[PDB]
Structure formats: C-alpha cells, structure tokens
C-alpha cells in the first residue's frame, strides 16, 4: 500500500509528531521513497526536511539495525 493512505490527516512541518513521522521510515531509520510514501514532490521535500530536523532533536533514529537474516 502507501504510507499516506495508511494514515489520517496530519501536518508535514511538525518536527515533534514522532508517532506519525516514524511511519515514513523503513525498518532501518531511512526515509522511504515516494514509491512507498505516496506523496507529491513538494510533500516529499517538506517531509524529508522535517525528518532531518527531528533526527537532530534526537526523536528519530539516524540509523538502526534490521532484525533479519
């Protein structure tokens, strides 16, 4: 599916709303492409900026470990 579809209404510029932002990160703490998030470019740009900001604030992980083979 898509991350946007698997979500209600929310703000993209909210750099503290961790519960929604975590939905846009893969198993590893990496930003998902538009292929997965299902956003327009402007939306993707704003989301990536916010993600980086939250990363700095320590709320979101820069990197992590995938628990598989």
């Amino acid at each position: 599916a898509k991350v946007k579809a698997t979500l209600g209404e929310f703000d993209l510029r909210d750099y503290r709303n961790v519960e929604v932002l975590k939905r846009f990160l893969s198993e590893t703490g990496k930003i998902l492409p538009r292929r997965r998030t299902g956003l327009s470019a402007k939306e993707q740009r704003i989301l990536a900026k916010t993600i980086k900001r939250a990363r700095i604030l320590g709320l979101l992980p820069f990197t992590e470990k995938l628990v598989r083979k």
């Binding site: 470990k65 995938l66 628990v67 083979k69």
Partner: protein, 119 residues
C-alpha cells in the same frame, strides 16, 4: 571457565575472509576463529565452506567454555554470510536473534581507487 552460558557472536564477513568472534553479553570476547585458523590459505579463506568451518569451530570452542545460546550479529557482505549463519544455527547453540550491523559511511572518508567511480 567463564561459564557465561549465554553470549553473542560477531561475524565479520569480508570478500577475502570470514572471522567469527564469540563474546560475553558485556562484549569482551571469549573465543574466536577464522578461515585461516582451520588451515586454508589464500583465496580458499573466502569460500563459503571456509565460513562454515570457521563458524563450527568457534561454536565448538564456545561450548567448551560452557555457552548454551547466543545472539548473532553479522557485519559486512562477504561470500560467507549466509553459510556462516546457517552453520552457527544448527551447531547446537540456540540462536535467538540475527542482526545485520553493516557499518557504512554517511559519505565520509574518500574510498580507495578500486572502490571509487561510484555515482
């Protein structure tokens, strides 16, 4: 001796070698083995079979120190990754978690000439 009975395993998988290091929860290594320790030299060290024997040998030693179960962490993307995981899985230790921990730069130091040309 240590009789920790529960530790973890670090599998450094390279293109040239595979090294398995068994360790306590605290991270202090207890025993280790590689492709070279078995007796292989040169390119033979890189083979998946070498990785299998390395994993089995390290596991046997760790059992001799009285372990029962580990938590395997794999680093690198060499040719002995899956073979080492499989070997350690059925060696008798009760592996609980398999974790990928490949350390990659965030576009840091400039790589060697052979590894450059990357877009």
């Amino acid at each position: 001796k240590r009789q920790v009975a529960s530790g973890r395993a670090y599998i450094h998988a390279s293109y040239n070698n595979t090294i398995v290091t068994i360790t306590d929860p605290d991270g202090n290594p207890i025993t280790w083995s590689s492709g070279g320790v078995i007796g292989y030299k040169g390119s033979r060290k890189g083979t998946p079979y070498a990785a299998q024997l390395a994993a089995l040998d390290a596991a046997k030693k760790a059992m001799a120190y009285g372990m029962q179960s580990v938590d395997v962490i794999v680093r690198g993307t060499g040719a002995g990754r899956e073979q080492a995981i499989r070997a350690l899985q059925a060696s008798g230790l009760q592996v609980k978690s398999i974790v990928d921990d490949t350390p990659v730069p965030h576009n840091g130091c400039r790589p060697k000439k052979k590894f450059r040309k990357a877009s």
